[PDB]
Amino acid sequence: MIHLIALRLTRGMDLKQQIVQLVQQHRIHAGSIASCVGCLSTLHIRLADSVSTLQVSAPFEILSLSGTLTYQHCHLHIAVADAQGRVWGGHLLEGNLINTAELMIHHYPQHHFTREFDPNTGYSELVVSAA
Amino acid sequence: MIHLIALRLTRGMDLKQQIVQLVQQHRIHAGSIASCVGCLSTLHIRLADSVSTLQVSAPFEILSLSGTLTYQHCHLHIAVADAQGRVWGGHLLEGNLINTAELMIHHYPQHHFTREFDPNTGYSELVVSAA
Amino acid sequence: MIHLIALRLTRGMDLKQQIVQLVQQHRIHAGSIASCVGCLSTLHIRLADSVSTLQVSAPFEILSLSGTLTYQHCHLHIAVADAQGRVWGGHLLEGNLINTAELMIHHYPQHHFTREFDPNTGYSELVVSAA
Ligand SMILES: [Zn+2]
Numbered sequence A, B, C: 001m002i003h004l005i006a007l008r009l010t011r012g013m014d015l016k017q018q019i020v021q022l023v024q025q026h027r028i029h030a031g032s033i034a035s036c037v038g039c040l041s042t043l044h045i046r047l048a049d050s051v052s053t054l055q056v057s058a059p060f061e062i063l064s065l066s067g068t069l070t071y072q073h074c075h076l077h078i079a080v081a082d083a084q085g086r087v088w089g090g091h092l093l094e095g096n097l098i099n100t101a102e103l104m105i106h107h108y109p110q111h112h113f114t115r116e117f118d119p120n121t122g123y124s125e126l127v128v129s130a131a
């Protein structure tokens, strides 16, 4: 059965760090982000070329946060909107500071997500199994 | 156990109003938006500076809708794409009119979300409790 | 009870085709996209005017994927970010090729989603029923 874990984050908290801590705290071995309405005072993302990075200290509304949660690694992608309504996004890094964040995580106790090195990509990739 | 509530919205309906009505109708005290594929004929959002607003009467595809649902308040953020594929988004206001909208809401009967004034923000913020 | 189906997609796979195949394989008559963190080497979307289309062969990070899943039809909308962090999106078409894609689908065994022609729109639209 899918379980819900909800938590409000406050000013100054690091989004990615808080999610990783929540995952470890609840012994989550398989999960995803259900919702994350909120705002940031600092955005820090890795871009689509997998190398460039963007850090901006300005107000951003969090529109969506998607993530594959495993105990040892959280793969999170975010979409945010700036003061003009334009949307930006990419791979979530450390340093994304909350300005509230109404975080909701879905935990899948019956599953076990892990990550194993993939010679074809050069990165550790998702491996799905039953728990 | 997480429950699903699905509803197709039709031309002219107000997105936010329909969600609020659904929440009250089903006595939802804790929930989130599972999905909302569809399109709008009018977009109306509050921007990241928390004051500016954008209203546009043009076709927009709804890409994602995230929300913290409580009986007395729905905090919704939307991401939409215009005719050129560019994405815009922000805090959902009244006035977002459906052009279909395939709405799916997740209800958490075991939880109770409320909102209490936060002197540190000046707004009512999410408070999570067990139901 | 909501069920989770997770699958990692690899290089060259067609996103929409893989989702349709998963839906048919698991006899899903009602479902939605829970998460889809990943990246594409080719983007192909129908835009908000419901006619224009954009196909781009460049790296894109998948930020969010929303979809109404029925056995005979999957209505999917995607939001992706380019190498500069700018977000683009629209109605998912065939031809969106994976560069990984950590796909998670939620199946609703107690529901039955179908699509029936709507004279008011000219398209087949979502009809929700109990299973
Ligand atoms: Zn990534």
Ligand SMILES: [Zn+2]
Binding pocket: A037, A038, B075, B076, B077, B091, B092
């Ligand atoms: Zn907001």
Ligand SMILES: [Zn+2]
Binding pocket: B037, B038, C075, C076, C077, C091, C092
């Ligand atoms: Zn569509």
